[PDB]
Each structure stands twice: as structure tokens, then as C-alpha cells.
Nucleic acid binder design. Structure first.
Ligand SMILES: Nc1nc(=O)n([C@H]2CS[C@@H](COP(=O)(O)OP(=O)(O)OP(=O)(O)O)O2)cc1F
Ligand SMILES: [Mg+2]
Ligand SMILES: [Mg+2]
Lengths: 403, 554
DNA sequence: GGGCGGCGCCCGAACAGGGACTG
DNA sequence: GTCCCTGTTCGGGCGCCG
């Protein structure tokens, strides 16, 4: 077959990103995979005259003996020239299949191959890096699903004809399948789609349930007697929350604080202050007004560590106009791994964001850069990688979304 | 010889042309060396006489080789390097002896005329033109161009390393069990074969290299230990560094201090307890590399310590893959940490130091976590394996820290080591306001134009106090007010501030700061029994905060 | 005595980003 | 927006190797 000419975004040069250290198992898996890939013509060895590079590592499913090679194409995807089933979020169950192998059936535009260069390292730098470049559609490149969309539609036409109640959507390397069937009837239908895929040369996250994803609302404390400190914390929380919920009033509660009082003094709520607290509790139940998804803007996802394996997150596009607010929990306090929990959180949030809007968010991570970059790859299980940045969050925003 | 390997295509940067730079005068000694080198290179096809119609030239020179009576011919290709395309370096790091495993038989090989044995792109050879001046009246001086890799070109290292990898690929595929550490042209070859079958394999490797145009002269064929490799001495069961010679200079410049710190940092890989904190602090403001700097008495003491350390003899051992990696970390003051990586109790694989000052305010738990991360990445580089840790911090301290901290933080499998100075949190802020303690509403304000300010407090027991400051800022006034409240309170105190800045600083439980004011606040907090720090929105009429806001904003 | 590439440490200079402020 | 404060990156020295 002939290729599709792909160009970069005008005014942009290819990626030049240093490879990072890998473990022994990852390097050996990468050497095996790349050897068997160059024997099949999917990649070719290159030298130093190619000035581009993107990092490479490998993941391994739990209770599995097969490794999956993962190229961090975030920069190249960010520089590639540009080219959603709203029902999928409303389905009973959704299963995610990995169809990236199919992309290896299509050749890549020869003038573009230099941009997919990557370098395998060695333990203790026994040798220089071994450099490769792709000859076919690489997994994890944003152009791979676009160039392949025609073949995918041709493959999936008869299955969709025989199953018009099933919603199947394609993200970068992932195929999401949604149905309202029983948990066993659903599992048998995907096995039909796997076998259907295998019959054409395209070889095929366990099971999603989008109707059970929940919104975490902002909540106020209920008490039988309030201290000065209690009222001060409540007033701070309501003052911040008025930026999201404009109806929140604080004047009456604040009047209880007039004077220079001790923190542990008991303050009886007046009927006006009780009325204000009641109406504020009510206002915190209405959803946010005027929040519309802009496809041309980037999704921002903020995460806050609440303690004891509890995490809060907000998906928005402009500050205080939240598209979604939720929480993620886990077993608490025995041998918890904060970094492992954070990566599981970012993967689940990215999954929700792809299912709802078909776009990954940019994560503001409440972690030091070095800790995250030291350990996050040991817990990654996805074939995409979201863009992220690291932020030293204030404890006040932790207190605001706390439960 | 010249390798029959195919060349690496190289182009100039778009719109650029080859260099045209006049040759500068050179010593007659260096000119004789250059002619002796160049007539030999020209007899062997490595350089070719060009005549007219070659408009390019770059200056050349020569320096004595490392530890030989031989000369090295360098070219100052800085203009051509400016005008040459970009390369991706394939040398990702430096091999370390601690990453070597025990081998039955070991050899070290140096390749002869490494660069000059690898061909250069035929289309690119024009821009490598140079001239020899031949100072005599009777000799005119000859113009040459390079047919092989020059020394001084930006692209020569990467091209040579990639080409050597290409050349070694077949031998490696046929001999997977033979290990070849390949630094630029140094080859360390280890095998589980007996001496005698190892030597025949080494001869096969030398024949392989010779077929690809690379000679391995006997003068650099190391056959028996100790092997001199990468600046180290490799004995059968221990390794060491070739001797460090610290400069014994009397007066010290910036360049002298940089050389001292570099030698100490290189020595710290196997010498425990090396510290360079005060020596490095000596370098803060100096606006030139030639300035003389009087040594601090702290710096002199640290330097004498490092000297006495270096006087002792020390070795390292080799890696045993069937055992665990163990890193053990010890603390010195001033944000300095030393570590030892080993597998058997008193047999170090290597050692190291971590001293980076990250953040204006921090504590020792943060620094220990940073050291753990650094050691993890280093041991992944050298062994591809994460080590097991032995830290001078108690499980209770760590669980308290990562309970109270709002950021995600974590440390791998570790074990408490009872060797002081232990790492501890020096105070813990209360989670609920304390009954019976006085309540201090604090605030500060600063005139942005005139830089004058006020910082003060109002207490619930009636006490009010305002202090006027000069050359201050808003954040400084808030911190000064918190300091004032700490100074005038009992062993237990509630403090209410309106400042996210100061609250975020103090909440993180710092024990060291580059700000003297924060250091004073830290001392106060350590002297207190119970402290509770509450926050309120500013300029909202919240009682207490309103009174101090009205007092401090006169 | 100077030219090249790699890694390391350590410092400062630019640059980015969030909070608090003036009238 | 400006001022302040803080974190990150990138370049320049030195060390070491070739
Ligand atoms: N200062 C140096 N600059 C370099 O570019 N190199 C490069 C070019 S030569 C190569 C290996 O160096 P080496 O010391 O073995 O010199 P060669 O001429 O290759 O070899 P021999 O002297 O024959 O052993 O490294 C080495 C240096 F010491
Ligand atoms: Mg040599
Ligand atoms: Mg204030």
C-alpha cells in the first residue's frame, strides 16, 4: 500500500528528548521486542545523524508473562499536524481492548520516519545506546488512529450492522466497547469482536461501568455546638466556595465572630446564621451553571491528597468552572504506596475523561518532580500517557475539598 | 588501516558554508610533530593533499598525549562545529566498576588510531581543509583534507561510538556470554572461560576488529591484573581509583576551588564522608573565575577533614547479582548526606554524597527522601535494580510525616538504623485549637511604594502590639507578625493569620531555611509545647483579624 | 595553553507561575 | 496589570573518561 504524507505543525522541529534509566527487566524485554520487530521490518537501526529522539520503556500486565513496549510520544504528538460518541458514557458496561498491533500493518510516510527515533540503553552503560526508527504506524502516535481509521471502519462495518446496540469507539491504541447486555452476554460479545478482529490480521483495563461513576459534592459539617474556630473554618470554606457557587452568603455567620475571642469559645448560632447555613447547604446541591466543554481548550485535572488513601480530583477547563469533581479511595493505612495510588488515580481519571469527552487531561500533580519521575513507571498499565505538571498545592485547597 | 564500514551521512546546517579561517602561528616543535604525523597519514590515505579550488581552512595544533612521548593532532573546528548539523549522542552514561561482576578471565584492549581508522563522509571532506605552515624558508607548507574522523569535530565522538557498536554487533551475536564493556575505544572483555580459552576468544575478537580496520596494539593489551581501566585499578576481587592528588595551593582562586571541589566529588564515589558544603558556598557571588577568595575557617576545617579522609586506604568490591543491593544513609549537618551501597556488611560496592539544597525552606525528612530518590536512580543506572535501604529515621517519624504532609511522598522497603544523628521532626502543629492557650490574631502590612511596614498582634486577653519595620514587604510583615506572637506567648499558643504564604511555609514543618527570619521562627516553634495555626480570609471583617488589620495599616 | 562528546556537582541568570495588592 | 517569592531549566566553570 501507499503511504499518507504527514507533516509537522508549521514552525516546529521534531522531538529531542533524552532517554531515561530503565531497569534490567525492562531493557531485556525491550531488546527482545525490538529484535523481533526489526526482523519483521517494522523498525530499522539508525545512527547519530538522526538528531531526534523520544524515550521508551516497557510495562507488564499483572499475572501476565508478556511485556508491552511503550514509547512516550507526548512531544511528537504535541508537534504533529492535526487531522465523539456521547452515548458511550451512558452505557451499562464498557471493555477496553488493545488494538495497537493493527497499526503495524500500514507503512509510515518515509519523510516522517526520522521523527520516531528512539534509543535503547544498557545496564551500567556497557555499550552506547542502540537507536531505531519506525517504518510502520507506531503505537501511541496520534497519527496512527487517523491514518488507520478507514481500515478500522471497514473492519467494524459488519459487526456494527449485526450489533447496532453496541457502541465501539477508538482512542489512540484503545477500542472501547459499550453495551447494555448482561455481564456474561457482554463478555461473549467482545469475544465475538476479538475473533472478528483476528480474521483480518488485527490482533486483539478489564471492564468499565460508566453509569457508576460518581460526583463528589462539596459538603459542610453538621454539629450540635460550634466553637469560634469551627465558625472561622466554615467561613473560610464558604468564602472559597462562593467562587464556584455564587449564591453562598457569609455575612450572618461572620457576624457571630465580631470581637477578639478565643478559639475554643462556644458560639450559639442565631436563627439568622442557622438560616444562612441551611441555604448554603442547599446551594451546594445545585450543579454549577454555565460550564460548557470547549473542544479546542485543554482539559485541566487537579488532584489533592486527602489522607488515608483518599484523593479528590477536579476536571475543568477554566478555573472554578468544573466539568467534574470526584474522589478515589483505597485500602487505607497498612502498606499504602502514595505514588502507586497517585498513578492509579491519574489512570482512572484519564479513563473517565476519554470515555466522557474523548481527550486526555493535563494533570496538576501534588507531588515532587523527582519522586514521581523516580517511581511512576513501575505502576503504569495504560498505553497512553497524559501530559502533566507538578504543583506545590496549598493546604487550604486540601481543606476545601475534604470530607 | 581504514575501516571498510560504510560512512555516516553528514550535512551542513541549511544555508551555511564551510569555514574559512586563517591558520595561526605554531611552535617549530609542533610543526615538526604535525609534519611527521601528516606525511604518515597521507601515505595511508587518511588525509589527501588538496590544491586550489578548495576555498576552506581551519586552524590546527598539537598537544602531547596523556602519558606518552607521542603527539595528538587536534583541529580547532569551532566554526565548522557551529555550522554542522545536529547529532543525537549515543553515549548515555559512564560505566562504573561497581557494576562489574566477577569474571574468570579479563582483558583490556585499546584500539590504535581509533578516529583515524574510521572513514568520513566523502561529500563532507571538503570542509575539513587545513594547512601546515612549515616555518622554514625552503619548505612551503602543505594543504590537506581529512578522509577520516578528525579530533575536534563535533560529530566525531557519536559517529565513532555508533560505528564501533556496528562493528562489534556480529562478534556479540556470535558470543553472547562474553562481556565487552565498550567505552570510546577502550574494550574491557570478561568471560567465564579459563585462561587459555579466553585468550583464543580474545584473539578471535582482535582478528574481527582487524578485519574491520581496527588494530589493537600490544603495548595497550592488558593481560594480567591490576587492570588500568576508566581511571580505576581493577584487581581480581577489589577495585580502587587511581590516586587523587588534591591541590595543596596556599591562596585560592575560583578556578582552584572548582578544581578542589571537582576532585573531592570524584573521590567521594569510594571515599566515605566527603563534604564540600563550605567550599562550594565559597563560590557564591564571585563575578570572575580568576578572583582570589579568602577561605572561611569553616571551609578550612572541612578541607582538613577531607584531607584526613583521603589519607586512608579504601577499595570497592564487584557486583554479585544473586544478592540484594543495600544502601545505608548517614547525615551530617548543613544539609549533607553520605551513603554506602554494599551487599556484604563491610564490603562497599560504592559510596556517595548528596548535598543539593532544594527549596528556600525544607526539613531533614524532605532531604532524606531526595537522597533515597537519587540513590535509587543511580543504582538503576549501574545495576538495573532498586536497592534496599537502611535509614536513620524511625517508622513512627515517617508515618507522622506522610500523615501530616499534603503532598504524595514515599520511600521503598527500608529498615531503621540506630546510628545518630537521627532524622526527626522538630515540632508538630496541632490539628485542633488548644484549650487554655492565648489566641493571637496576627497581621502585617507594607507600603509598596515607600517599603515601610507594620507587623502586630491582638490577643483575646486584651494584649495588643504593633512594631514598625523598614525596607520590608507584605510577606515579610506577615512572617514578622507570626514571629512576634511566638516571642510574646507562653508554651502553648493559638495563632490566627490571614496569610496563605506564611501558613504554607510553617505548615510544611521546616527545620532549616535560607531566610534568617524563618530560622528565628523555627527556633521559636521548636521551643514551644503546643502551637495551633489557623487561617482566615483577609479583609472580611472576621473578628480579631479585623482589629489587627486596623492597627497594622495606620 | 587552547579542539570534541559523554556523565557528575554547583552556582547564577532567565523565565514561569501563584498570591496579594490600588483606587 | 505590579511586586514578591518560589521553583525549574539551561549554561558556564571544574572533575573524570576516551
Ligand atoms: N583528549 C582527547 N580527545 C579526543 O577526542 N579523544 C578521542 C580521539 S582518539 C580517541 C581514543 O583516544 P586515544 O588516547 O586511544 O588515542 P588514539 O590516537 O585513538 O590511539 P593510540 O594513541 O594509538 O592508542 O578519543 C581522546 C582524547 F584523549
Ligand atoms: Mg586508542
Ligand atoms: Mg494580612
Amino acid at each position: 500500500i501507499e503511504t499518507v504524507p504527514v507533516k509537522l505543525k508549521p514552525g516546529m522541529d521534531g522531538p529531542k528528548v533524552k532517554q531515561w534509566p530503565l531497569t534490567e527487566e525492562k531493557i531485556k524485554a525491550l531488546v527482545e521486542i525490538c529484535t523481533e520487530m526489526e526482523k519483521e521490518g517494522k523498525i530499522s537501526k539508525i545512527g547519530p545523524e538522526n538528531p531526534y529522539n523520544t524515550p521508551v520503556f516497557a510495562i507488564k500486565k499483572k499475572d501476565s508473562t508478556k511485556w508491552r513496549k511503550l514509547v512516550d510520544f507526548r512531544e511528537l504528538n504535541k508537534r504533529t499536524q492535526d487531522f465523539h460518541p456521547a452515548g458511550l458514557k451512558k452505557k451499562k458496561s464498557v471493555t477496553v481492548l488493545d488494538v495497537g498491533d493493527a497499526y503495524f500493518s500500514v507503512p509510515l510516510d518515509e519523510d516522517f520516519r526520522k521523527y520516531t527515533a528512539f534509543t535503547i540503553p544498557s545496564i551500567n552503560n556497557e555499550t552506547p545506546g542502540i537507536r531505531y526508527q519506525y517504518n510502520v504506524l507506531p503505537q501511541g502516535w496520534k497519527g496512527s488512529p487517523a491514518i488507520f481509521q478507514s481500515s478500522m471502519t471497514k473492519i467494524l462495518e459488519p459487526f456494527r450492522k449485526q450489533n447496532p446496540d453496541i457502541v465501539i469507539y477508538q482512542y489512540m491504541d484503545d477500542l472501547y466497547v459499550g453495551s447494555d447486555l448482561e455481564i456474561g452476554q457482554h463478555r461473549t460479545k467482545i469475544e465475538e469482536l476479538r475473533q472478528h478482529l483476528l480474521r483480518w490480521g488485527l490482533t486483539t483495563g478489564y471492564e468499565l461501568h460508566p453509569d457508576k461513576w460518581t460526583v463528589q459534592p462539596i459538603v459542610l459539617p453538621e454539629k450540635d455546638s460550634w466553637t469560634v474556630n469551627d465558625i472561622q473554618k466554615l467561613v473560610g470554606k464558604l468564602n472559597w466556595a462562593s467562587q464556584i457557587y455564587p449564591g453562598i452568603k457569609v455575612r450572618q455567620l461572620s457576624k457571630l465572630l465580631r470581637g477578639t475571642k478565643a478559639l475554643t469559645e462556644v458560639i450559639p448560632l442565631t436563627e439568622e446564621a442557622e438560616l444562612e447555613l441551611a441555604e448554603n447547604r442547599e446551594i451546594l446541591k445545585e450543579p454549577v451553571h454555565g460550564v460548557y466543554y470547549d473542544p479546542s481548550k485543554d482539559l485541566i485535572a487537579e488532584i489533592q491528597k486527602q489522607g488515608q488513601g483518599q484523593w479528590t480530583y477536579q476536571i475543568y477547563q477554566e478555573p472554578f468552572k468544573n466539568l467534574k469533581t470526584g474522589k478515589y479511595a483505597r485500602m487505607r493505612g497498612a502498606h499504602t504506596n502514595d505514588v502507586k495510588q497517585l498513578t492509579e488515580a491519574v489512570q482512572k481519571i484519564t479513563t473517565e475523561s476519554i470515555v466522557i469527552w474523548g481527550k486526555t487531561p493535563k494533570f496538576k500533580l501534588p507531588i515532587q518532580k523527582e519522586t514521581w519521575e523516580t517511581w511512576w513507571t513501575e505502576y503504569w498499565q495504560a498505553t497512553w500517557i497524559p501530559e502533566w505538571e507538578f504543583v506545590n498545592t496549598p493546604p487550604l485547597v486540601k481543606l476545601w475539598y475534604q470530607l | 588501516p581504514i575501516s571498510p564500514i560504510e560512512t555516516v551521512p553528514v550535512k551542513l546546517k541549511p544555508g551555511m558554508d564551510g569555514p574559512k579561517v586563517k591558520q595561526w602561528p605554531l611552535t617549530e616543535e609542533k610543526i615538526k610533530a604535525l609534519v611527521e604525523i601528516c606525511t604518515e597519514m597521507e601515505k595511508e590515505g587518511k588525509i589527501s593533499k588538496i590544491g586550489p579550488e578548495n576555498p576552506y581552512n581551519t586552524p590546527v595544533f598539537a598537544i602531547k598525549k596523556k602519558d606518552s612521548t607521542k603527539w595528538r593532532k587536534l583541529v580547532d573546528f569551532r566554526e565548522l562545529n557551529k555550522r554542522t548539523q545536529d547529532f543525537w549522542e549515543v553515549q548515555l552514561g559512564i560505566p562504573h566498576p561497581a557494576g562489574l561482576k566477577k569474571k574468570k578471565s579479563v582483558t583490556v584492549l585499546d584500539v590504535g588510531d581509533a578516529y583515524f581508522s574510521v572513514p568520513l563522509d566523502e561529500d563532507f571532506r571538503k570542509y575539513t581543509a587545513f594547512t601546515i605552515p612549515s616555518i622554514n624558508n625552503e619548505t612551503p607548507g602543505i594543504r590537506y583534507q581529512y578522509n577520516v574522523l578528525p579530533q575536534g569535530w563535533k560529530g566525531s565522538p557519536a559517529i565513532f561510538q555508533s560505528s564501533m557498536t556496528k562493528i562489534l554487533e556480529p562478534f556479540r551475536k556470535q558470543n553472547p556470554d562474553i562481556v565487552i564493556y565498550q567505552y570510546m575505544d577502550d574494550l574491557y572483555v570478561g568471560s567465564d572461560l579459563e585462561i587459555g580459552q579466553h585468550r583464543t576468544k580474545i584473539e578471535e575478537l582482535r582478528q574481527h576488529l582487524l578485519r574491520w580496520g581496527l588494530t589493537t596494539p600490544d603495548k595497550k593489551h592488558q593481560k594480567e591484573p591490576p587492570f588500568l581501566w576508566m581511571g580505576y585499578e581493577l584487581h581480581p576481587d577489589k577495585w580502587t581509583v587511581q590516586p587523587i592528588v588534591l591541590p595543596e595551593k596556599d591562596s585560592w582562586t575560583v578556578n582552584d576551588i572548582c578544581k578542589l571541589v571537582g576532585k573531592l566529588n570524584w573521590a567521594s564515589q569510594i571515599y566515605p564522608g566527603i563534604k564540600v558544603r563550605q567550599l562550594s558556598k565559597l563560590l557564591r557571588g564571585t563575578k570572575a573565575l580568576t578572583e582570589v577568595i579568602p577561605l572561611t575557617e569553616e571551609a578550612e576545617l572541612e578541607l582538613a577533614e577531607n584531607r584526613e579522609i583521603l589519607k586512608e586506604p579504601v577499595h570497592g568490591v564487584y557486583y554479585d547479582p544473586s544478592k540484594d543491593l543495600i544502601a545505608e544513609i548517614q547525615k551530617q549537618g548543613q544539609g549533607q548526606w553520605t551513603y554506602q551501597i554494599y551487599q556484604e556488611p563491610f564490603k562497599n560496592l560504592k559510596t556517595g554524597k548528596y548535598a543539593r539544597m532544594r527549596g528556600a525552606h525544607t526539613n531533614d525528612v524532605k532531604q532524606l527522601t531526595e537522597a533515597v530518590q537519587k540513590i535509587t536512580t543511580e543504582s538503576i543506572v549501574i545495576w538495573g535494580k532498586t536497592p534496599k535501604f537502611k535509614l536513620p529515621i524511625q517508622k513512627e517519624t515517617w508515618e507522622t510525616w506522610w500523615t501530616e504532609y499534603w503532598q504524595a511522598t514515599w520511600i521503598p522497603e527500608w529498615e531503621f538504623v540506630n546510628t545518630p544523628p537521627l532524622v526527626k521532626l522538630w515540632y508538630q502543629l496541632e490539628k485542633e485549637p488548644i484549650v487554655g492557650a492565648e489566641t493571637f490574631y496576627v497581621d502585617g502590612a507594607a507600603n509598596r511604594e515607600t517599603k515601610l511596614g507594620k507587623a502586630g498582634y491582638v490577643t483575646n486577653r486584651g494584649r495588643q502590639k504593633v512594631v514598625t519595620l523598614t525596607d520590608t514587604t507584605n510577606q515579610k510583615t506577615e512572617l514578622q507578625a507570626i514571629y512576634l506572637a511566638l516571642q510574646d506567648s507562653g508554651l502553648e499558643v493559638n495563632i490566627v493569620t490571614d496569610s496563605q504564604y506564611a501558613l504554607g511555609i510553617i505548615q510544611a514543618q521546616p527545620d532549616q531555611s535560607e531566610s534568617e527570619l524563618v530560622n528565628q521562627i523555627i527556633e521559636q516553634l521548636i521551643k514551644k509545647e503546643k502551637v495551633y495555626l489557623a487561617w482566615v480570609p483577609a479583609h472580611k471583617g472576621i473578628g480579631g483579624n479585623e482589629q489587627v488589620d486596623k492597627l497594622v495599616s495606620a
